[PDB]
Design a protein around this ligand. Structure first.
Ligand SMILES: O=C(NNC(=O)N1CCN(C(=O)c2ccco2)CC1)[C@@H]1Cc2ccccc2CN1Cc1ccccc1
Length: 122
């Protein structure tokens, strides 16, 4: 399965599944800076799933590793901002992260395998 480009549509489909998850609600759009007035004191680099989808559609990811780094930033930001581990929004982040990790692993493995096949004789 050595298609170097296949990751992009696989990531579009996984983003569609994440948008169908009720657990993505808080992460779809930027953290509301009016409601959380201290957010940018705590979080240096905001990230959300709409920004990830637009960056993919613009052709501004070169690999699924770069997409994965941005999605993992959504989850680390939630963990850094939460006042407690039993918070609703952080709790949603942990379930959504587990879902994401379960489905991104084959996308990353197939991409890295395809690149190694491309260089097999170099
Ligand atoms: O909620 C939102 N965005 N993000 C945050 O405000 N968050 C709070 C902070 N945070 C944390 O990680 C965290 C950890 C512990 C505590 O917070 C990330 C999440 C946005 C805001 C917004 C503004 C203007 C119009 C619409 C919306 C939609 N909203 C959600 C939504 C999405 C789809 C449908 C219904 C509602």
């Amino acid at each position: 399965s050595y298609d170097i480009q296949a990751w992009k549509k696989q990531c579009e489909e996984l983003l569609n599944l994440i948008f169908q998850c009720e657990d993505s609600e808080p992460f779809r759009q930027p953290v509301d800076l009016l409601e959380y007035p201290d957010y940018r004191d705590i979080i240096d680099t905001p990230m959300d799933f709409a920004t990830v989808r637009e960056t993919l559609e613009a052709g501004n990811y070169e690999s699924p590793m770069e997409l994965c780094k941005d999605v993992r930033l959504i989850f680390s930001n939630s963990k850094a901002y939460t006042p407690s581990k039993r918070s609703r929004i952080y709790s949603m982040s942990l379930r959504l992260s587990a879902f994401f990790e379960e489905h991104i692993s084959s996308v990353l493995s197939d991409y890295k395998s395809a690149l190694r096949f491309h260089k097999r004789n170099t």
